Amino acid sequence: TYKYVNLREPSMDMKSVTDRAAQTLLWTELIRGLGMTLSYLFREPATINYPFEKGPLSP
Amino acid sequence: XXXXXXXXXXXXXXXXXXXXXXXXXXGYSMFAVGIGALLFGYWSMMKWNRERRRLQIEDFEARIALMPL
């Protein structure tokens, strides 16, 4: 079917080059990656402590 | 009647789609804030350094004024 992993260079001229250069000069996308686990901290953990709570099973 | 496992369609979950999208910063917009913070940064910092000069001369004046020391 072919999905293709290669993007064949997203940058071309002026507008497409400068924004791709801005993320490599400072960070931006790493701060975007930093914010990915920020929301993960905010949501409740799906944790079960054994001596009191028990896990799901089958008949 | 014999009952078995039933099928469900509705929306079919929607498989294979790019959820990643650019947010907040575009490119040209963040540089205006970046250099803008620098221009505000140096201007506000040097005003305190000029205010330090008012103290600097006056502090060293104490040694000149006091000769019985």
Print the SS3 string covering B39-64.
Answer: HHHHHHHHHHHHHHHHHHHHHHHHHH
- The coordinates were experimentally obtained by cryo-EM
Distance from CA of B15 to the nearest CA of A (A): 14
How many other CB atoms sit within 10 Å of the CB of residue A20? 14
Pick from A19, A23, A25 the residue to mutate for testing the B interface (most B CBs within 10 Å): A19
- Is the C-alpha dihedral spanning B28, B30, B33, B35 positive or negative? negative
Cα dihedral value A9, A13, A19, A24, nearest 10: 60
Residue B26, C-beta contacts closer than 8 angstroms, at least 6 positions apart: A19
Q: Tell whether B25 is within 8 A of chain A (Cβ).
A: yes
Distance from CA of B64 to the nearest CA of A (A): 51
